[PDB]
């Protein structure tokens, strides 16, 4: 196999990690296992500390001359690598013990556990005015040498490693989306009926969506246009529940429904990133440093209806709107989830 | 710079039931992003192993692949009577993707 390693710029402190992406299984997420290598003489009675942090960030320490760069913590954990803490967790993982065998006595295992309620890795798309990075939630692992956690030492003898928390498509088919809305008229018994339904609950990235629409226009009013769109809802909750919604895909058909007639059609719509690079504030999947990534996957939540998820939650819905003459339009919304298939 | 994949030997011959191995040396590290393809004479290539160790679906288990640093080897346990072909080594860590020079396995 292989294992990732990174070292301090002084080249004395090195941290080993077996993975970069840790998958959340909705009951437990992969524990962060690794060892840190440091010469016991360079420390000189100093202590090696490793911290795991996930935080809202608007631009990292990229040395960019731009001023503003916010940072709001969401979770903080600490671990004393050297000298060793009490036994629990008593058994080191197989990766940890193999790394200790490979490196020797100068390596020290460190263990982390990510709580269930923590958010996934989501990156907001930077706008034209924003340079470098933009807002997003990301995970971080830092190793440093100090006498105590609060000591302000020479912070150049530290190594920072970016890791990711990800989710994959659940291995079960959900209920088929469907929604009906009948527009009643007070002046008579005429009523305009609109139906819309998808074919699956879950769709992969790049997989087309088929929407079946049935219209029963039993009224004198004429439908002028039919619009089918996919919207992304991002729930940014850090101090107040702020929601940002942005359309990610649209299809327009000039399908006029004549009065006292029935209409049925199937539309194919596929959300992707090429047509919507310009949309500032669009939720994207967590990047490592800068590499291109697709649209943000939906964030499924624990079935226990847990709250206070302090991060970014992204969901997708399909909106079908009927353009009716003399106003009085009717709309239907169908929610679906967008995910990646579980790797083999 | 561009990555040069060097595959040896240029050709080899072994009777049915023998064991052969083909090596592929990368000029620069490719992080195990290596794929092996088999081409019958006058036909399109078929993917055999991706990620230098993961066997593609439908490929018989006699085909094997391993990584040793910057060296990648493709191994066949027993040469079937239909296993003669030209085998290519490809890396896809960096653009452009570069192929091997081929190894004609004869009967």
């Amino acid at each position: 196999t292989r294992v990732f390693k990174k070292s301090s710029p002084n080249g004395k402190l090195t941290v080993y990690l077996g993975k970069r992406d840790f998958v959340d299984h909705l009951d437990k997420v992969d524990p962060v296992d690794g060892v840190v290598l440091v010469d016991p003489d360079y420390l000189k009675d100093r202590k090696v500390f490793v911290t795991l942090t996930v935080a809202f960030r608007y631009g990292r320490e990229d040395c960019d001359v731009l001023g503003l760069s916010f940072r709001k913590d969401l979770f903080i954990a600490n671990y004393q690598a050297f000298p060793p803490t009490p036994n629990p967790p008593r058994p080191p993982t197989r990766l940890q013990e193999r790394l200790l065998r490979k490196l020797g006595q100068h390596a020290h295992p460190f263990f982390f556990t990510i709580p269930q309620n923590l958010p996934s890795s989501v990156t907001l798309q930077p706008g034209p005015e924003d340079t470098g990075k933009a807002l997003g939630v990301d995970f971080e692992i830092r190793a440093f040498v100090a006498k105590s956690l609060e000591e302000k030492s020479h912070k150049r003898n530290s190594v920072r490693l970016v890791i990711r928390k990800v989710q994959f498509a659940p291995e079960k088919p959900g209920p088929q989306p469907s929604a009906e809305t009948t527009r009643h008229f007070l002046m008579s018994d005429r009523s305009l009926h609109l139906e819309a339904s998808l074919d699956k609950e879950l769709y992969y990235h790049g997989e087309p969506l088929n929407v079946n629409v049935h219209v029963t226009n039993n009224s004198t009013k004429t439908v002028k246009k039919i619009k089918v769109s996919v919207r992304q809802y991002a729930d940014i909750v850090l101090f107040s529940t702020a929601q940002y919604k942005v359309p990610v895909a649209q299809v327009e058909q000039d399908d006029q429904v004549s009065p006292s007639s029935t209409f049925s059609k199937v539309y194919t719509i596929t959300p992707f990133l090429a047509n919507n690079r310009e949309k500032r504030g669009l939720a994207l999947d967590g990047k490592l440093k800068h590499e291109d990534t697709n649209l943000a996957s939906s964030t499924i939540v624990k079935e226990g209806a847990n709250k206070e998820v302090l991060g970014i939650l992204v969901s997708y819905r399909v909106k079908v709107k009927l353009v009716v003459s003399r106003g009085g339009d009717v709309s239907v919304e169908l929610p679906f989830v967008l995910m990646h298939p579980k790797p083999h | 710079s561009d990555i040069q994949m060097t595959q040896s030997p240029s050709s080899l011959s072994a009777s049915v039931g023998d064991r052969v191995t083909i090596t592929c040396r990368a000029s620069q590290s490719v992080s195990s992003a290596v794929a092996w393809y088999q081409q019958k004479p006058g036909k399109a290539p078929k993917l055999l192993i991706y990620s230098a160790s993961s066997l593609y679906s439908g490929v018989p288990s006699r085909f094997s692949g391993s990584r040793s640093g910057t060296d990648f080897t493709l191994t066949i346990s027993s040469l079937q009577p239909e296993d003669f072909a030209t085998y290519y080594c490809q890396q896809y860590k960096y653009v452009p993707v570069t192929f091997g020079q081929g190894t004609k396995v004869e009967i």
């Binding site: 196999t1 292989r2 294992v3 990732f4 390693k5 990174k6 070292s7 710029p9 080993y16 990766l95 193999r98 790394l99 065998r101 490979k102 490693l161 | 992080s31 640093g69």
Partner: peptide, 9 residues
Amino acid sequence: ENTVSTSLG
């Protein structure tokens, strides 16, 4: 420097 991989045996 930056992130890189190793054998682990």
